[PDB]
Design a binder for this molecule. Sequence first.
Ligand code: PHE
Ligand code: PHE
Ligand code: PHE
Ligand code: PHE
Ligand code: MN
Ligand code: MN
Ligand code: MN
Ligand code: MN
Lengths: 344, 344, 345, 345
Amino acid sequence: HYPTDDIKIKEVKELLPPIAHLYELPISKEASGLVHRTRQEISDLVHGRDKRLLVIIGPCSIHDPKAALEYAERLLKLRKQYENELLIVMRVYFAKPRVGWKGLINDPHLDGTFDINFGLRQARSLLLSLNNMGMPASTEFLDMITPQYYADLISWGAIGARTTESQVHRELASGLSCPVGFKNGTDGNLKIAIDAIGAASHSHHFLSVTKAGHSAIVHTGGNPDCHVILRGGKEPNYDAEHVSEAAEQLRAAGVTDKLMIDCSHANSRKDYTRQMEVAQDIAAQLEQDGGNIMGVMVESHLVEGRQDKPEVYGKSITDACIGWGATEELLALLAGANKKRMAR
Amino acid sequence: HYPTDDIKIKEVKELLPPIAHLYELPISKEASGLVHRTRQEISDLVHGRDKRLLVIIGPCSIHDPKAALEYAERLLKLRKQYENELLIVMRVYFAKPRVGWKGLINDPHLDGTFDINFGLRQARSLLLSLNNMGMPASTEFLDMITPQYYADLISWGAIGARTTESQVHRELASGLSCPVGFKNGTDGNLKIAIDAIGAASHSHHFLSVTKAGHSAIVHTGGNPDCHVILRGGKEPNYDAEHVSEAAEQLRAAGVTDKLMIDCSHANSRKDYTRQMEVAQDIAAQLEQDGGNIMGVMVESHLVEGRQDKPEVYGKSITDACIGWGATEELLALLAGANKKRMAR
Amino acid sequence: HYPTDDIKIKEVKELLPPIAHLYELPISKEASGLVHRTRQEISDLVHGRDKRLLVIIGPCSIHDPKAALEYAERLLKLRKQYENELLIVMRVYFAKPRTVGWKGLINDPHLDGTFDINFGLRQARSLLLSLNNMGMPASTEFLDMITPQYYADLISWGAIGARTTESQVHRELASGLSCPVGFKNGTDGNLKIAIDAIGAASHSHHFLSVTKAGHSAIVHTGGNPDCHVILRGGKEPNYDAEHVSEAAEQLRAAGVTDKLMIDCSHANSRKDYTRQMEVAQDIAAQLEQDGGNIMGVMVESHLVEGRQDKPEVYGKSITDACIGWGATEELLALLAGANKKRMAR
Amino acid sequence: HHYPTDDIKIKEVKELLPPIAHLYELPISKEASGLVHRTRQEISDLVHGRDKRLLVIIGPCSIHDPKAALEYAERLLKLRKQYENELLIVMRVYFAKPRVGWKGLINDPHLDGTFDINFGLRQARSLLLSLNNMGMPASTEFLDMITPQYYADLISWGAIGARTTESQVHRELASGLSCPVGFKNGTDGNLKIAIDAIGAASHSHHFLSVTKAGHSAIVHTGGNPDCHVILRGGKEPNYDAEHVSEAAEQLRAAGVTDKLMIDCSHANSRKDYTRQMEVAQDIAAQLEQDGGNIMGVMVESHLVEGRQDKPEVYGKSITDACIGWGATEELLALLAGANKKRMAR
Ligand SMILES: N[C@@H](Cc1ccccc1)C(=O)O
Ligand SMILES: N[C@@H](Cc1ccccc1)C(=O)O
Ligand SMILES: N[C@@H](Cc1ccccc1)C(=O)O
Ligand SMILES: N[C@@H](Cc1ccccc1)C(=O)O
Ligand SMILES: [Mn+2]
Ligand SMILES: [Mn+2]
Ligand SMILES: [Mn+2]
Ligand SMILES: [Mn+2]
């Protein structure tokens, strides 16, 4: 026999099964309540039963648990203060969808050693600490296996621009315990996200692993808590005209016309200093009408900007983020605007 | 103590591991020769060493292995006849990337019962029978787990238009033993596929299973045999102007400027009779110059058109296909056109 | 670091999990029915509910499935012929507990030294399924804690041999086996170890094995109330009335069942397959006199008598020596006659 | 539906955390690796006659409490260092006796019948890594074919007990253990099973178990050349000079090492801990006269003497009765005394 199997494979190493991580780090009664409740609260937002604004906000990527926990500590205070106008959940994303650093799960030690057992442990550990302190977590799931390791700790999931059209990621979302947001495509196709909600609301089958770590078929029940995310395209799509047009196509498709607006990425034009602009336009809509907005997303860290090496504490090494002060302003701006909308 | 795990899952059933299927249906020496050889031949096309045309052709999707075998039986004689001008490899795709029928792996019995162990068995059996008879096989990998069950029998793989931009599908491609084609986006975005080749040529790490069925981290070494597939979008992109523009961009990104043209899907605009037209243009191109074309894709079946239910034998239940007579003319057209290119 | 792990291991290779084999060879309706029934029928003998004699009879070891099947076709006739007097169940043991040479049909199914265990295990399940489907139940020895997951669903009666009867894990195993189990006395004739094994196996225990899916697992057992002793001699033969009587006394004293099995082969025969008949005559004389403590016998039998080092002749053992088919007819006819009279009392 | 045939007598089969999960949480350290590699080699030297120190396997009958066990180890480690030129001291870290009652530390770590085996295996590995880290090698008995994948990398010396020495699979296991292995004589004093065991264990075999990832597996061994017998009595003790001589003669006749270990406890003490000293005194007299064929002894010792049905008292056995710490010092001072003189010849 000529060889035909694993020709271009350096190594296939066994990973500790999810059950191993769940044994060391069982979810606590407290994290369980914060998760269950935040998910329900978000459901109400998706389906129009509450007019609070869901704010997904935090670092572009997590590369340092200390800074992440310190960021949460400061955010927790504002989560409480604006709890009547805003439902603040923290971005706990472990990589960018990219060339550069491959994320915290792949490369937890920031040196190129790919210790993914440790990476996954750290991600779970972080997510339980956060929930335990009272800060819910959100994340993007890039693949169909990692969710088994910590989705139990996640109160809101994203499927990014580059995966919203992928069948298997829609099948994933259809079984995720948390509400899920589908982003529009990298060039501004909103339809792919609309179809994804359709798909995600039905029952599907996809492949993954059991909690015990073995190949498996997953039969989902459908996810009725999905929604669109406006993150821009060739041009930005945050304004009232783009919101109104999205809302119409949503209704026509017979899915929720309540949606979320990313202030960052292509809606800012990859310029962190324009997130405030977007949030200001969103504030104007809320004060006017803004019936179709249920959430915003905001890339934010202790220190503003980007760096290639993790030199500065609390500075992103993936996309550029606004800093803490700009975070106080933006959140305040949104809370006040939405106080007025809810008051009508 | 609120539940948070698997809230929207009906069932997670463990699957027979790949080793089980590999025990019942080990790759034979002759299939192993055919695959090894065929990957290498295709790799020569991708890199400009051989001017024969790769022809990926066959059903939109396999819904009946018996008819698929009979198809292959007719195709093989054409493979042999045109072996100096065309390298003919059969489409063995088990699903459309969507609605309705979930494909042969999910739903092998065509009634709705989701017998996945059986479907995986049937897919491997069909692929081994095809190789053993001397017909190489091609397919699309939609997830990161199914390759372990039968990628060893695959001479060419596709990442489809809906997944080319997906990070995890790029990582997968980087570790596939076969050469891989990346389709352009559903709206015509060629860049996502050019970036995909760049991405897939490097080492990555993604999650999957071992042959024994255990969750695994897999370290790839890069796939140097990737290329682009022009597939249409808002308008078709098969003509010389589009081919020439794409070649420049490929050169600019420093990747192979030899590409593949799908005669079906958004180039035929879902009209199966127009695939013959696309081939005509392609043939006229090759006759003038056609330096940048290394293959084409055709959707072809025993009988033409499509049907919703599998009533008629060898007739598609997914995208409509040209029938056997049109397939003969198309392949003769392409053989003759490329005979003249090669003779220059 | 210095190394400390796997220092004396040439390789550890993965095996197909039990489910892969149970997928290919699912137990049939009629195989299920035969297994259940037979286990129940044997239980009744263990516990004095029925006076039929269990006869565990067949090759010392299976080295050729085709031979095994032809053997089963002939025995089947007699199983049916003598169904009112004898419960005939075939021996399907895949190795002798050795000590250098052929390591059995599971380990070495090709009989050339390759160790294709995936294949052996499939072949063994395949044979046990075909035997049951034809109306012949099967018996075997389980040497380890993992093999029973592959084919115990096809076994109507199992043995724990002389060399493992005292082993704590083998007793815990037996406590979780679905079939009734016979515990052999020690190689030097020690009966107490088998008496203790009955009491031990009746309780609930825990041991390590694999799930059907092939992963490390803890097995919490329910207890096996259908165990009994097997007299197989040792320093001296223990098939006669006097030995049977001393054993029954010790068994009653421990509060376990005083119904036992007698091996006519191995050390009771002194490794001479022609003495198997003599032992059966003795057992038959006992059954005629009284023999109330006997529920079964064991007999090593094959198409062709004797043994051989290489598998040259069809139907002849390459492990212990067996009586041939003619002698089998005598033996079974003899025991059926002696027990017919017992059951008439 | 079919008649049922599968797991009729099973309460449950719960899947287990795989060895890799414990190996991740508790990886062997560089210093523990050195001690294990070095101690294994030193013991091999003792087995093959290259060093004349006495291997002393000493410690509790069974470990029911790691705190007590760690304290016992700190005390023993002093005498390990003190007597290093005369005795090779290694701690007994047995997790159960091969038995109904308490099922051991691995099976039932919480001593209350809850059977939390993931925790038990976690605890056993932890204690063993802590012992090697403080500088005290560890010995244990392997009762099955699976547990070793969880912590054998931390064992410097292995026992196969009296009740398993004759078992085919246990001998096959032994042939793949990274550590040296002592085989005990049978519960009735049969020495031959142990001598056969050494022979068997020195060759390559194939037995079934699990990969480190927990998957059903076939294990191919390279043989264990470092095996020896352990004399632990029978119907009568077998520690004296005469029994030692006759054993050495049979060992030589079989072509295997005539160097042996004497267990001072169990059937050599007549199951009476007060007699372990008697046995140790005789062995000492032998070492002073000649004692050439003795390479080790086994002593059942704990912080406090005797035993108890329930774990009320700290550092007192709940399995076999042990000598207390005072006696332990007395016994070790004696052996070091006797062997200093033997080594000086
Ligand atoms: N555990 C995930 C669902 C899931 C199951 C299996 C595979 C992947 C995802 C959740 O609760 O959301
Ligand atoms: N076995 C695949 C590569 C692969 C390994 C593991 C997971 C996914 C893909 C091949 O030969 O192409
Ligand atoms: N499946 C075996 C019992 C068993 C379970 C698990 C391990 C070993 C044996 C039977 O039914 O007899
Ligand atoms: N890991 C054991 C050997 C072993 C392997 C596999 C199963 C059982 C035992 C050792 O180092 O000694
Ligand atoms: Mn970002
Ligand atoms: Mn198609
Ligand atoms: Mn025999
Ligand atoms: Mn003891």
